[PDB]
Short mmCIF file of C-alpha atoms and ligand atoms in Angstrom, two decimals:
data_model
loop_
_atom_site.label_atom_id
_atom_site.label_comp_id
_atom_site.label_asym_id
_atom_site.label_seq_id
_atom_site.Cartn_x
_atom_site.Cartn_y
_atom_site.Cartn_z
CA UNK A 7 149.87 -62.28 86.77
CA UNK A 8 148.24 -64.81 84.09
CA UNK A 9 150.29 -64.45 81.02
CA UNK A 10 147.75 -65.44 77.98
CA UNK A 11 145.40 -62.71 80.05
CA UNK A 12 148.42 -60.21 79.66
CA UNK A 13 145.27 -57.65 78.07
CA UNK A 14 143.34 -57.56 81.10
CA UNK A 15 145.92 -54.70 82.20
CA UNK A 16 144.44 -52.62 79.80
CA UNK A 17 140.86 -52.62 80.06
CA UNK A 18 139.52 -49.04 81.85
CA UNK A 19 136.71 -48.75 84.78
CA UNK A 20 134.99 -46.31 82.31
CA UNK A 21 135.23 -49.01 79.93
CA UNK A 22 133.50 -51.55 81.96
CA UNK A 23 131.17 -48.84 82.98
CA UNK A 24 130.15 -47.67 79.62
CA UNK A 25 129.94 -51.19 77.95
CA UNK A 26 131.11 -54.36 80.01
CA UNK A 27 129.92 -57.01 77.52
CA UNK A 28 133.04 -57.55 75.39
CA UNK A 29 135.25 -57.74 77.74
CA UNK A 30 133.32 -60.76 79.58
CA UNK A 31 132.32 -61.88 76.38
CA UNK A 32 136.48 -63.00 75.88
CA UNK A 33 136.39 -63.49 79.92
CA UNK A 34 133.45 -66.57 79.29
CA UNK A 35 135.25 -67.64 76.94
CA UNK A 36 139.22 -67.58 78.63
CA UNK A 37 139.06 -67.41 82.08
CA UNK A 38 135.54 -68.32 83.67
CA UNK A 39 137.67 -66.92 86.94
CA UNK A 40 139.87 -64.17 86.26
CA UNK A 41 141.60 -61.75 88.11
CA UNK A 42 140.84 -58.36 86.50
CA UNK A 43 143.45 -55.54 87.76
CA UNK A 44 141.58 -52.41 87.61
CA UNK A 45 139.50 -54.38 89.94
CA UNK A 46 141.94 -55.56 92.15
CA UNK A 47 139.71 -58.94 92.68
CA UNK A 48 139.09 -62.36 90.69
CA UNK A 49 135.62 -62.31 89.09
CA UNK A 50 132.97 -64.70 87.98
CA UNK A 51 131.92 -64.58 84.63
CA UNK A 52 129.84 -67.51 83.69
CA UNK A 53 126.98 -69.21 84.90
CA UNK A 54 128.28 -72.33 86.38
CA UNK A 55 130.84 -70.29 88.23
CA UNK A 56 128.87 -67.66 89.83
CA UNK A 57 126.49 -70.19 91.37
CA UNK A 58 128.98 -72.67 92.06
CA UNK A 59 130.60 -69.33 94.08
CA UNK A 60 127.13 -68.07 95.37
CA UNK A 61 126.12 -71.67 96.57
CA UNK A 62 129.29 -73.36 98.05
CA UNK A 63 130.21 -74.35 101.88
CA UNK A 64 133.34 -73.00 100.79
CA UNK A 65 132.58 -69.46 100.69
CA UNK A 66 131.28 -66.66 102.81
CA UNK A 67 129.54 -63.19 102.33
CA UNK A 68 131.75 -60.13 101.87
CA UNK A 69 131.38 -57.17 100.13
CA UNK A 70 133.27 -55.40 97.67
CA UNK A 71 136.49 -52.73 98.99
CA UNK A 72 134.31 -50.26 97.43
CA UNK A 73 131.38 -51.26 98.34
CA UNK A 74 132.12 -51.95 102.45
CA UNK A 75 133.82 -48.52 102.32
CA UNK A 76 130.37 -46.90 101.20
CA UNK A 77 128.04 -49.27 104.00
CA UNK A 78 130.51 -50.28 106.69
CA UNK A 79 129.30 -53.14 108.94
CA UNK A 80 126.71 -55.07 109.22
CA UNK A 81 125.40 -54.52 106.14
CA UNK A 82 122.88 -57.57 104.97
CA UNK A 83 124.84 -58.57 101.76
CA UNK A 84 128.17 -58.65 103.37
CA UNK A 85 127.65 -60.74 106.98
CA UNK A 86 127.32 -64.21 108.07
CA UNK A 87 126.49 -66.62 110.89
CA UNK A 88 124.07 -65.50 113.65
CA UNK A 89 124.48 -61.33 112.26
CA UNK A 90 122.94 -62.53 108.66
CA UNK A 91 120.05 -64.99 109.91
CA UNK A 92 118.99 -61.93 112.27
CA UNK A 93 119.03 -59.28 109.43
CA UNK A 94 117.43 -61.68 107.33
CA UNK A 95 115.13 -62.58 110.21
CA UNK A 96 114.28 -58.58 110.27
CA UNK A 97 113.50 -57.95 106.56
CA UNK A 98 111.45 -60.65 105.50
CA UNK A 99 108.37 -60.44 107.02
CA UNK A 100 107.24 -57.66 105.14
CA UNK A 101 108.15 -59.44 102.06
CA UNK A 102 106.97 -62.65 102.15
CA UNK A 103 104.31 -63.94 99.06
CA UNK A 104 101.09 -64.42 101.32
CA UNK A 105 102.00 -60.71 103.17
CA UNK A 106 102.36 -59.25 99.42
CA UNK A 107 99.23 -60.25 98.19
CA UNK A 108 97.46 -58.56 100.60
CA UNK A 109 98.19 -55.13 99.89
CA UNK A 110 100.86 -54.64 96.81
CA UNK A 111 98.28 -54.01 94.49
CA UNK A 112 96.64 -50.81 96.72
CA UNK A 113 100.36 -49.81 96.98
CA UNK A 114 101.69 -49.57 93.89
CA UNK A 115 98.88 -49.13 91.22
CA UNK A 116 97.62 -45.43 92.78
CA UNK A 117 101.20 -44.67 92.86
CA UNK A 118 101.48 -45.67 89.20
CA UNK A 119 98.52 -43.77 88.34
CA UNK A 120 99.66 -40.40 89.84
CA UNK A 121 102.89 -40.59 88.27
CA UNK A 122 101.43 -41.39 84.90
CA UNK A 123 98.46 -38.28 84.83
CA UNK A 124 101.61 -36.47 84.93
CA UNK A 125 102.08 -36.99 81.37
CA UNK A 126 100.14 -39.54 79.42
CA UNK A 127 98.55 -36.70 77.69
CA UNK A 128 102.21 -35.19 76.85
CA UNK A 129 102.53 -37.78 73.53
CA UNK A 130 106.70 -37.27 74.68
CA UNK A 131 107.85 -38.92 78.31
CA UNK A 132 111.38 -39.17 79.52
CA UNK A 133 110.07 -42.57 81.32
CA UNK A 134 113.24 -43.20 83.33
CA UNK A 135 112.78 -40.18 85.28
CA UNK A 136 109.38 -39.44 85.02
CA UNK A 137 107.88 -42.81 85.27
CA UNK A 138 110.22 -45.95 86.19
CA UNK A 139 112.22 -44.44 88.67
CA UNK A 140 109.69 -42.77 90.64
CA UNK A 141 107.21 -45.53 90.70
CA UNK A 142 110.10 -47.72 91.83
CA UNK A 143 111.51 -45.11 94.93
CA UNK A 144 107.64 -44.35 95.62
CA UNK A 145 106.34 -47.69 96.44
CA UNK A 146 109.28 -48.89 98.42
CA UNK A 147 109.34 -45.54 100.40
CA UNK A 148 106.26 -46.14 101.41
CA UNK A 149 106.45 -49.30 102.42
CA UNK A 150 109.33 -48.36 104.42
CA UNK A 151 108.13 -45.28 106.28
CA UNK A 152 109.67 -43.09 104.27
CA UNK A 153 106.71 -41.09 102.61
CA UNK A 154 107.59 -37.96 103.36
CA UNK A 155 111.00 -38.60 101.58
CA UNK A 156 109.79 -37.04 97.96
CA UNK A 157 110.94 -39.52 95.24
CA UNK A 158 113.17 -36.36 93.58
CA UNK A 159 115.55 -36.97 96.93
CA UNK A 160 115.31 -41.02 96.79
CA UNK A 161 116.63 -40.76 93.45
CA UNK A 162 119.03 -38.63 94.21
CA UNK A 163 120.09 -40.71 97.06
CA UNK A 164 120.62 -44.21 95.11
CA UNK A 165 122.38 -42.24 92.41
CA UNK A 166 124.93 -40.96 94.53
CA UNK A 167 125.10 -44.53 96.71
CA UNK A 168 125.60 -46.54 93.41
CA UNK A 169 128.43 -44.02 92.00
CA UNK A 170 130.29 -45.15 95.63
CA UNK A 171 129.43 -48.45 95.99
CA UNK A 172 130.93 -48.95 92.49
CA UNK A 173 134.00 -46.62 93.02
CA UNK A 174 135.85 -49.80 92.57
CA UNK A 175 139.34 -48.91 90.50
CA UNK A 176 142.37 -49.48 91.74
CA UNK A 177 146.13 -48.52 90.95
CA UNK A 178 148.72 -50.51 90.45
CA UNK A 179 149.41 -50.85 94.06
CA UNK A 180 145.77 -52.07 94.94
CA UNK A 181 144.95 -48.66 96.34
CA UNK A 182 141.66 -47.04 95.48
CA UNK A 183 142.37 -44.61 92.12
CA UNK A 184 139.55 -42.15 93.08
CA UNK A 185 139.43 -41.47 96.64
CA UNK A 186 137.56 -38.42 96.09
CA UNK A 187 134.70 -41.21 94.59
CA UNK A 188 133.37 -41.79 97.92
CA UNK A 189 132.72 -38.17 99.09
CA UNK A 190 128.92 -38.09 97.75
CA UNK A 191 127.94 -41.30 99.21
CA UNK A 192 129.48 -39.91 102.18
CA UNK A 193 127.29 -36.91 102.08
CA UNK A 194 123.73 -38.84 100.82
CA UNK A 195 124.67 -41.05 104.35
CA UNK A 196 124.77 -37.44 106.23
CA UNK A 197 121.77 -36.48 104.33
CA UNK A 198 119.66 -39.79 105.06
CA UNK A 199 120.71 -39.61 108.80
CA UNK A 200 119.00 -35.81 109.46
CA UNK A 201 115.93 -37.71 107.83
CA UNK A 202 115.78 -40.96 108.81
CA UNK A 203 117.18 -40.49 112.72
CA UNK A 204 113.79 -38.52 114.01
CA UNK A 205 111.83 -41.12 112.76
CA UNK A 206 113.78 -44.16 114.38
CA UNK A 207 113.32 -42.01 117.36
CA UNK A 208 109.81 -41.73 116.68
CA UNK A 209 109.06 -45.52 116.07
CA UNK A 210 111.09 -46.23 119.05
CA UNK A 211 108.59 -45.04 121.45
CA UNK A 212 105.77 -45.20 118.92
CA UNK A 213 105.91 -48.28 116.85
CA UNK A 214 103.60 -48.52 113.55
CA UNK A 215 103.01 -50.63 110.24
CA UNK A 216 106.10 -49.21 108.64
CA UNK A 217 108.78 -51.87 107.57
CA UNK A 218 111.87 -49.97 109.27
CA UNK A 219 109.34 -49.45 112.38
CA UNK A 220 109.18 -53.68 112.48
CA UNK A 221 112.90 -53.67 111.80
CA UNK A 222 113.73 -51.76 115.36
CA UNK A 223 110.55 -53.95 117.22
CA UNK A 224 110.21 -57.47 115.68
CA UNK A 225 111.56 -60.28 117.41
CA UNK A 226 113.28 -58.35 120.63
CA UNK A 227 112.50 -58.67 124.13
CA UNK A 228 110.03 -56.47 125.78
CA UNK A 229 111.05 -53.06 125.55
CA UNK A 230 113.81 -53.12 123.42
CA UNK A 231 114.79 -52.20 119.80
CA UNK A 232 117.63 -52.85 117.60
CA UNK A 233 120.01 -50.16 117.77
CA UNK A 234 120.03 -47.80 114.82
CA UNK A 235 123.71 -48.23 114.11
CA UNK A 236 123.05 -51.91 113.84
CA UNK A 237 120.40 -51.17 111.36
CA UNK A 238 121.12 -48.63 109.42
CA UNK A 239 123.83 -50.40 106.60
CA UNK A 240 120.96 -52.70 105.87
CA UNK A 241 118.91 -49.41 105.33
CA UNK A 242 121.64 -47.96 102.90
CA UNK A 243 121.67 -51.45 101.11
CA UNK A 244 117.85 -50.63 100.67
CA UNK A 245 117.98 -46.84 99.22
CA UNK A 246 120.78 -47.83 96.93
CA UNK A 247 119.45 -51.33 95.64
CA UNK A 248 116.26 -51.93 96.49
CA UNK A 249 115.24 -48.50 95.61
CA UNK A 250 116.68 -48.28 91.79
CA UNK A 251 116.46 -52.02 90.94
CA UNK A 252 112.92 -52.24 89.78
CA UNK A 253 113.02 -49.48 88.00
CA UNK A 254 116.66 -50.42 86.03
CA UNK A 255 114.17 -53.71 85.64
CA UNK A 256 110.95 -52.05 84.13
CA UNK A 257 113.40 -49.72 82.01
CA UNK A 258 115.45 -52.68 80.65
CA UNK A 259 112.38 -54.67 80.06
CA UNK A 260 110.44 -51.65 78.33
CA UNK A 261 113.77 -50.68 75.52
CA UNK A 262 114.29 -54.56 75.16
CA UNK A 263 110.54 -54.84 74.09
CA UNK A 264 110.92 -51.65 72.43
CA UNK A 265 114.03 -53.80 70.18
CA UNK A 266 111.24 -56.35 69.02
CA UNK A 267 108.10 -53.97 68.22
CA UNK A 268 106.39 -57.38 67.18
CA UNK A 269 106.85 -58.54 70.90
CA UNK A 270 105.83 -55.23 71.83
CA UNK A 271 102.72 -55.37 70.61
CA UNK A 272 102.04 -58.60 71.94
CA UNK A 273 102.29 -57.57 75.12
CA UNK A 274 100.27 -54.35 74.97
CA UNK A 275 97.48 -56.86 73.53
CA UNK A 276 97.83 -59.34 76.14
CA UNK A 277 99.01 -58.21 79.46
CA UNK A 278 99.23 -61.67 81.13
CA UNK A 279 102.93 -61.93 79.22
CA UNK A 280 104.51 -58.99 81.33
CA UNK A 281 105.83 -61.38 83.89
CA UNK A 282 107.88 -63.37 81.00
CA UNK A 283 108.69 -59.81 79.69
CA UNK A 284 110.18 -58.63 82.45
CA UNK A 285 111.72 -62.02 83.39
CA UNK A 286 113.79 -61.72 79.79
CA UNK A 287 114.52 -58.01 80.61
CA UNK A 288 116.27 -59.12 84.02
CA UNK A 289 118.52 -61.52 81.83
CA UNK A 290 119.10 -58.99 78.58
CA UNK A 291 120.73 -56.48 81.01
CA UNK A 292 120.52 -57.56 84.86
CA UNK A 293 119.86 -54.75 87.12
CA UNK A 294 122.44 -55.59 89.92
CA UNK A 295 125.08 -56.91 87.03
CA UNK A 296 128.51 -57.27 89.16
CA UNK A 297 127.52 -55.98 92.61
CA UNK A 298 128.43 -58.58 95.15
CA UNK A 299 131.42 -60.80 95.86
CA UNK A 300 132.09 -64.15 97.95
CA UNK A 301 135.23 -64.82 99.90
CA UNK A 302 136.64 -68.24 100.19
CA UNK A 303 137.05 -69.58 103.70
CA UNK A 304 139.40 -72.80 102.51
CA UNK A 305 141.66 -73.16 99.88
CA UNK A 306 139.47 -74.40 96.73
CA UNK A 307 139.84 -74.69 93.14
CA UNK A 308 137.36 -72.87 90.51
CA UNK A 309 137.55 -73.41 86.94
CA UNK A 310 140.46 -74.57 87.20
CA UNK A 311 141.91 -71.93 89.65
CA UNK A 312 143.70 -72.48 92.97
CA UNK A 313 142.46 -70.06 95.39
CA UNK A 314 144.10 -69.76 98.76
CA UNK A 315 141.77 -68.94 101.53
CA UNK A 316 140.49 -65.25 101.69
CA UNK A 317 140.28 -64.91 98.50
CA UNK A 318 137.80 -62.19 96.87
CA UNK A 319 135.31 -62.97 93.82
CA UNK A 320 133.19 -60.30 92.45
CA UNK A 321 129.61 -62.25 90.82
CA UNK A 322 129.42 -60.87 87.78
CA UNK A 323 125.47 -62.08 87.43
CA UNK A 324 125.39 -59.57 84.31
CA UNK A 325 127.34 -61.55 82.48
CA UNK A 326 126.65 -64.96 83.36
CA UNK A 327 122.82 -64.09 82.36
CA UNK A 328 124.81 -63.85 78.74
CA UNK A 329 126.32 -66.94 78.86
CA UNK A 330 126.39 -69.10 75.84
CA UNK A 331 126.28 -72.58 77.45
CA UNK A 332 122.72 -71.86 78.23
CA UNK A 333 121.00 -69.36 75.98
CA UNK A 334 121.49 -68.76 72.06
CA UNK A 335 121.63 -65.24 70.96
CA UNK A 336 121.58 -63.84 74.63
CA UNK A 337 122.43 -60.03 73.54
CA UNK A 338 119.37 -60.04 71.72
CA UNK A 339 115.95 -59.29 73.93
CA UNK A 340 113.63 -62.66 72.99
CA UNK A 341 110.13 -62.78 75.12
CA UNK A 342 109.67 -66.06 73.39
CA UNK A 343 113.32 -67.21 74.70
CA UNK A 344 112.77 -71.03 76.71
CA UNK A 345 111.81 -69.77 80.37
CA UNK A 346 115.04 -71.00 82.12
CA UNK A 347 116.60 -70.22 85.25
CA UNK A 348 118.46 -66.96 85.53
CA UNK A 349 120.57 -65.62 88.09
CA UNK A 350 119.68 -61.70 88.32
CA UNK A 351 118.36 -62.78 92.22
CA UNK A 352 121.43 -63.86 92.54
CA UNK A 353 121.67 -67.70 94.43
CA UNK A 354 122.39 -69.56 97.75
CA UNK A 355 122.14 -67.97 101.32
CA UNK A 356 122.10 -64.59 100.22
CA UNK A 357 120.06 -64.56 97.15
CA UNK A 358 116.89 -61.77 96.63
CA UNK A 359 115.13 -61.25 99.32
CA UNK A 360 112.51 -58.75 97.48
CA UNK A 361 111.99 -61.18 94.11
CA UNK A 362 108.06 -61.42 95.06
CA UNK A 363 108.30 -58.02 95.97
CA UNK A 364 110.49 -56.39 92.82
CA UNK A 365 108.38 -58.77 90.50
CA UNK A 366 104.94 -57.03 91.22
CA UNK A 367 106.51 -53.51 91.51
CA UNK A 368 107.34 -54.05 87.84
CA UNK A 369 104.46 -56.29 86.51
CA UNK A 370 101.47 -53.34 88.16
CA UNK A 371 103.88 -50.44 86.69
CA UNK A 372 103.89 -52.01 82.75
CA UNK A 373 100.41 -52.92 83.46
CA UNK A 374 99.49 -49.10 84.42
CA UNK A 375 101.73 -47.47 81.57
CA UNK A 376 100.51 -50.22 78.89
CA UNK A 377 97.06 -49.17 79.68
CA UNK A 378 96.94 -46.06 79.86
CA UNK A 379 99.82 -45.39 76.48
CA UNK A 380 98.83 -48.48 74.24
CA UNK A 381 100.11 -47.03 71.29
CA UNK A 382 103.65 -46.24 73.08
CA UNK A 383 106.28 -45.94 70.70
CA UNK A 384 110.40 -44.89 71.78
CA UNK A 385 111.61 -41.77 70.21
CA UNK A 386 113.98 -42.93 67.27
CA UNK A 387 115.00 -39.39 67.52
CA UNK A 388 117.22 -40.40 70.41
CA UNK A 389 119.41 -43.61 71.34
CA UNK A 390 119.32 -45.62 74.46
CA UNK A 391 122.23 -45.60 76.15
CA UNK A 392 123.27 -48.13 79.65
CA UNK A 393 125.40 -47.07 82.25
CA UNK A 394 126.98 -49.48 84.62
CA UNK A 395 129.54 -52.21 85.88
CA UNK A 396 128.09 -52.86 89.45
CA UNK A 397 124.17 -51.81 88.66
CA UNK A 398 123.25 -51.67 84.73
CA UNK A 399 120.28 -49.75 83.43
CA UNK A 400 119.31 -47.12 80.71
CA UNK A 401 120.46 -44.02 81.66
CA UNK A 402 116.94 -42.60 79.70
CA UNK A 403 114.25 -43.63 77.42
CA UNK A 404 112.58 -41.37 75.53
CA UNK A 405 109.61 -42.14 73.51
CA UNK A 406 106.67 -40.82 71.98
CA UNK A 407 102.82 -41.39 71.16
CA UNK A 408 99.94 -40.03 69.00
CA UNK A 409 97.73 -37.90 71.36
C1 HEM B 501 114.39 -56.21 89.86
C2 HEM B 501 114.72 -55.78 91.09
C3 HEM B 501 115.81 -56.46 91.92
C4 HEM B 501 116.87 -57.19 91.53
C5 HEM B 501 117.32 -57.58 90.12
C6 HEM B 501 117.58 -57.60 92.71
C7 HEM B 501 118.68 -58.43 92.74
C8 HEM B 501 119.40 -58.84 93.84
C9 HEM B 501 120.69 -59.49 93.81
C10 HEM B 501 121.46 -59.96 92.59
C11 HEM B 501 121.06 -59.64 95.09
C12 HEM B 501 122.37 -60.29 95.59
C13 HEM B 501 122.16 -61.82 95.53
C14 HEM B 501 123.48 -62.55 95.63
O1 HEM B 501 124.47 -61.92 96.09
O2 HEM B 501 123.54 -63.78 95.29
C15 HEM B 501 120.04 -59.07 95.93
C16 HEM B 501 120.04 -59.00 97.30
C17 HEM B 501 119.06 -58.47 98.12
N1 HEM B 501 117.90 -57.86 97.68
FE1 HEM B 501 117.24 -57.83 95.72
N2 HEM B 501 116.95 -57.10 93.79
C18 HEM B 501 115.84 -56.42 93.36
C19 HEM B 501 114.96 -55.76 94.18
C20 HEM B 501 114.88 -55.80 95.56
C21 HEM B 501 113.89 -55.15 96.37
C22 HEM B 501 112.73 -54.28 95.84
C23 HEM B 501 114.15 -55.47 97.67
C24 HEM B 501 113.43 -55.09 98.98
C25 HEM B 501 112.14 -54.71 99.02
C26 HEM B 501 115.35 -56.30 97.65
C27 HEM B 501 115.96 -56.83 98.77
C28 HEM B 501 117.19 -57.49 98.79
C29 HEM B 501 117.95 -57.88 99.98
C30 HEM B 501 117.50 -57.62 101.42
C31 HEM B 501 119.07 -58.48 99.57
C32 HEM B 501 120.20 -59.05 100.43
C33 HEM B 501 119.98 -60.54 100.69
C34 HEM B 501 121.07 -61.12 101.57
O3 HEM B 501 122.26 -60.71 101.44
O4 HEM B 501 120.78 -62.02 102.38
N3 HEM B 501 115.74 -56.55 96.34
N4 HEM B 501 119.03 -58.59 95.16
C1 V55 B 502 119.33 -55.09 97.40
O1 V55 B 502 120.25 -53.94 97.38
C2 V55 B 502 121.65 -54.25 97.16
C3 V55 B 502 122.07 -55.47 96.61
C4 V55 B 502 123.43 -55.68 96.33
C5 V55 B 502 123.82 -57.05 95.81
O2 V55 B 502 124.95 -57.30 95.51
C6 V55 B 502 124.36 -54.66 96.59
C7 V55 B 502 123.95 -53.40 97.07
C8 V55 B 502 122.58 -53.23 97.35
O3 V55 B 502 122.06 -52.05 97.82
#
């Protein structure tokens, strides 16, 4: 409806899928708030606007058309009021900093170790599949109570939940343009039930140290548990996010690195700069890049646009983790870049639960590979290429090493 933005009716989902960054490189630049058609929603673009959005009393959770069609209600990203402080009230125990330290490292190193005498002798790796991934889908399975779920079917499962949650297009009548989008999210739901429904039944009547096991128990009367249907979007919001993110970090971090071999080698030679590593990687290409939205619960104006109430914005974090007004050269990877504050944890009320959490996962998985490949090297052979509006990561990364 904006004139001067007349060309926003011609940019393509696949588009923003296969490469979002020039289109909200002219977005930063025009319209900090723009309503993007294929869309069908305003979105934040720049820094200032996504966490004015994510922080202000005049705005609410919500999530995304496509993205409440795949989870339904109450999912944790998309509630409010009493509903949100009890979900949030459920998962954080298990992730808070002192609870962490007691046990992350007995988690996740052994599970990087098996993973990696898979193929450190190989001198070839795949590591997006055969490392990142599976260390990610490993660890937080087994936090969960999930480890007899093999890390082939968690994979599979936040593969096919991201491709729904991020079936956003829509015509020109606001109508979703692939219904048939949401059929394999549909079917990973029916899949995780048959799983995942004995074992609520189990923990139910026997309760253990799992995290979904405290999620039913913690915080109820005598006797009683959450009901399943109550938990079980904040479960999905778990095997699609929490699940893929640290690996889509560790990835990014690792091709980013692989960009600057000087860095590289820096940080094979002195592990203590992972965490600044992988805190550049979650800016160079944020994992959840334009997942989550806000709704307005007053009229308010945003960079300069009036928005009645009930009025959709999609945080583009992504992009605003590019923005010019606070970094220089953002599209290039820079572990020497002036630590600053970045929004891939997104902000306010409903920011990262899991930072402490996500942040280990990937620091003890670089650790693990840098130790036992030193002399990794990516295959030049092949190009890196990144998939994604709503979640961004390397769809592979193959590299190499002398045996
Ligand atoms: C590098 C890995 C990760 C990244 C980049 C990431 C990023 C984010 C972002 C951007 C949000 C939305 C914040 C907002 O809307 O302002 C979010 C929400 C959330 N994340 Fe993380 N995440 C990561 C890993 C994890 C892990 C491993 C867990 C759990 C163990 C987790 C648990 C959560 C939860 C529960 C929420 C919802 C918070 C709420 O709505 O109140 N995250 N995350
Ligand atoms: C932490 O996992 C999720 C986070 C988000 C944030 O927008 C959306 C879907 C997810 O599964």
């Amino acid at each position: 409806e904006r004139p001067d933005l007349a060309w926003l009716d011609e940019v393509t989902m696949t588009q923003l899928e296969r490469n979002p960054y020039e289109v909200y490189e002219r977005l930063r630049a025009e319209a900090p708030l723009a309503f993007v058609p294929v869309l069908g929603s305003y979105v934040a673009s720049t820094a200032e606007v996504c966490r004015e959005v994510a922080t202000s009393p005049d705005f609410e959770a919500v999530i995304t058309p496509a993205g409440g069609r795949t989870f339904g209600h109450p999912a944790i990203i998309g509630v409010n009021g009493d509903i949100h402080a009890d979900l949030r009230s459920m998962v954080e125990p298990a992730l808070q900093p002192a609870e962490v330290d007691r046990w992350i490292d007995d988690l996740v190193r052994p599970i990087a170790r098996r993973y990696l005498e898979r193929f450190e002798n190989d001198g070839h790796a795949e590591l997006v599949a055969q490392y990142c991934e599976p260390v990610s889908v490993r660890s937080l399975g087994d936090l969960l109570g999930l480890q007899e779920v093999d890390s082939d079917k968690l994979r599979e499962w936040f593969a096919k939940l991201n491709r729904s949650f991020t079936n956003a297009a829509v015509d020109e009548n606001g109508e979703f343009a692939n219904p048939e989008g949401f059929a394999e999210g549909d079917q990973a739901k029916a899949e995780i039930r048959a799983v995942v429904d004995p074992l609520i039944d189990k923990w139910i009547e026997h309760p253990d140290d799992s995290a979904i096991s405290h999620w039913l128990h913690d915080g109820m009367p005598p006797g009683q548990t959450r009901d399943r249907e109550y938990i079980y979007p904040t479960i999905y919001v778990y095997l699609l996010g929490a699940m893929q993110e640290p690996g889509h970090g560790m990835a990014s971090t690792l091709v980013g690195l692989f960009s600057r071999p000087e860095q590289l080698e820096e940080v094979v030679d002195d592990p203590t700069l992972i965490p600044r590593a992988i805190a550049e990687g979650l800016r160079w290409t944020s994992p959840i890049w334009s997942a989550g939205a806000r709704i307005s619960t007053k009229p308010v104006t945003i960079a300069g646009v009036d928005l009645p109430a009930g009025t959709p914005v999609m945080l583009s974090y992504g992009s605003a983790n590019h923005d010019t007004g606070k970094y220089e050269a953002p599209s290039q990877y820079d572990l020497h870049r002036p630590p600053l504050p970045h929004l891939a944890f997104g902000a306010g009320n409903h920011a990262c639960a899991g930072i402490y959490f996500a942040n280990h996962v990937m620091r003890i998985a670089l650790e693990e590979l840098f130790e036992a490949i030193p002399n990794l090297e990516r295959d030049t052979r092949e190009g890196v290429e990144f998939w994604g509006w709503g979640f961004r990561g390397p769809t592979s990364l193959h590299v190499t090493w002398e045996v």
